[PDB]
Amino acid sequence: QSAIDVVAEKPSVRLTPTMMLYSGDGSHLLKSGRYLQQELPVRIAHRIKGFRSLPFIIGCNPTILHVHELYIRAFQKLTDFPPIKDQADEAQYCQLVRQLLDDHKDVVTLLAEGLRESRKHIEDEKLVRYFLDKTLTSRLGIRMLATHHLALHEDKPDFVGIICTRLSPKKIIEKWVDFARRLCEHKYGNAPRVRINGHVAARFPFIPMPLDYILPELLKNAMRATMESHLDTPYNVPDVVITIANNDVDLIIRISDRGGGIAHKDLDRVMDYHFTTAESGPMHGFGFGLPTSRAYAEYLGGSLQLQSLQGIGTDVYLRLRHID
Numbered sequence: 214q215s216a217i218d219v220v221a222e223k224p225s226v227r228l229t230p231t232m233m234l235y236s237g238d239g240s241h242l243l244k245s246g247r248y249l250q251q252e253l254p255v256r257i258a259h260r261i262k263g264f265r266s267l268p269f270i271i272g273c274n275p276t277i278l279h280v281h282e283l284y285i286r287a288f289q290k291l292t293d294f295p296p297i298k299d300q301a302d303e304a305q306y307c308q309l310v311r312q313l314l315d316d317h318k319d320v321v322t323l324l325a326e327g328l329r330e331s332r333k334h335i336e337d338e339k340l341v342r343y344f345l346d347k348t349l350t351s352r353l354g355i356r357m358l359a360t361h362h363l364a365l366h367e368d369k370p371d372f373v374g375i376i377c378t379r380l381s382p383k384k385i386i387e388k389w390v391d392f393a394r395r396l397c398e399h400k401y402g403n404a405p406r407v408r409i410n411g412h413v414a415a416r417f418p419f420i421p422m423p424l425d426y427i428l429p430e431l432l433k434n435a436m437r438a439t440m441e442s443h444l445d446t447p448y449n450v451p452d453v454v455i456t457i458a459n460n461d462v463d464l465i466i467r468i469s470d471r472g473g474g475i476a477h478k479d480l481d482r483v484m485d486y487h488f489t490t491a492e493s494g495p496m497h498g499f500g501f502g503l504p505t506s507r508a509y510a511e512y513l514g515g516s517l518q519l520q521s522l523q524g525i526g527t528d529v530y531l532r533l534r535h536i537d
């Protein structure tokens with residue numbers, strides 16, 4: 214379709230998280246609702262462009278092709294919606310956006326399947342990694358863009374849309390530690406104790422959404438490695454130690470385990486999608502954890518770095534740029 218061609222090369226327009234906190238308002242909601250309406254088809258055209266650029270033999274996979282078709286169908290609906298003139302139009306478009314986000318929450322699982330099935334025809338190792346990095350960061354971009362606007366209409370304490378005004382890293386880490394320990398206890402009959410130190414009283418404006426993927430994943434990796442390396446003494450395992458470092462530039466979360474480390478022979482593969490030694494949105498398994506967490510961290514001005522002490526344990530450093 215030529216309508217997709219019109220915006221496929223159009224640069225994305227992003228608001229700065231700082232500017233989104235600055236705007237803290239029906240007259241301003243109308244301005245941002247029109248913005249969403251104009252921006253969302255551009256993000257979808259950018260995804261269609263990705264599918265159009267895939268090698269023909271990969272793009273021809275029925276599962277990959279079906280996802281390509283889903284995006285084309287969604288683009289038609291977003292562009293078919295008439296322009297927003299008042300708050301009544303602004304609210305009917307929110308409903309359409311909510312519906313389409315919900316109907317396609319599961320697309321990453323389908324893409325991962327299609328790309329697995331096409332593995333024999335993938336001669337370039339970097340091609341799948343680059344496609345999936347772009348897919349996961351753009352899908353997070355779409356999610357944050359749409360969910361933030363929907364949340365601006367709601368009156369949640371300590372939030373301006375999806376931006377928490379006083380996020381505590383210790384609190385969000387504890388929420389996920391409890392969840393991970395509960396599941397780890399179900400699987401092994403025990404879970405390592407998690408100690409949290411450093412800047413335990415830090416609070417600052419932050420978007421928790423990416424941490425809700427990264428933290429349970431990095432905690433699972435640390436707890437699982439700890440249990441897998443201490444199966445001979447499963448009720449006496451070393452603690453996972455998490456350090457919080459907060460400065461004016463970034464937030465650092467170091468997760469240190471005594472789970473034996475990442476072997477030298479696996480080191481150059483742990484950041485690949487589908488690489489695993491274990492027996493809605495991106496998957497929390499199938500070797501998607503580390504590369505998704507890194508793509509997320511890099512997309513938000515930070516990084517995800519690993520330090521392996523083979524025979525002892527691993528230190529994982531999650532760095533995320535502050536909003537200020």
Ligand SMILES: CC[C@H]1CN(Cc2ccc(-c3ccccc3-c3nnn[nH]3)cc2)c2ncccc2O1
Nearest residue numbers: 283284287313314317318320352355356493494495
């Ligand atoms: C709004 C219309 C678009 C939306 N997208 C993209 C989209 C959808 C859901 C989530 C999402 C919503 C809730 C929770 C999680 C996640 C998610 N994050 N990463 N992947 N899915 C994100 C990104 C989409 N995808 C395929 C075909 C058509 C599509 O129509």
Ligand SMILES: CC[C@H]1CN(Cc2ccc(-c3ccccc3-c3nnn[nH]3)cc2)c2ncccc2O1
Nearest residue numbers: 227228229230354355357358361512513514534535
């Ligand atoms: C000044 C340039 C920006 C570049 N980025 C990227 C960036 C932009 C918007 C959102 C976002 C936040 C909340 C809601 C929506 C969206 C958004 N808009 N479009 N796509 N995502 C997230 C991440 C960035 N990252 C971290 C800290 C500061 C940053 O300064």
Ligand SMILES: Nc1ncnc2c1ncn2[C@@H]1O[C@H](COP(=O)(O)OP(=O)(O)O)[C@@H](O)[C@H]1O
Nearest residue numbers: 434438474483489490491498499500502503527
């Ligand atoms: N803290 C860790 N200690 C030891 N091995 C780890 C650790 N984190 C990751 N790994 C290794 O890296 C692999 C890939 O990790 P990940 O991408 O999160 O996917 P998955 O959890 O599905 O296996 C794991 O299967 C494991 O071999």
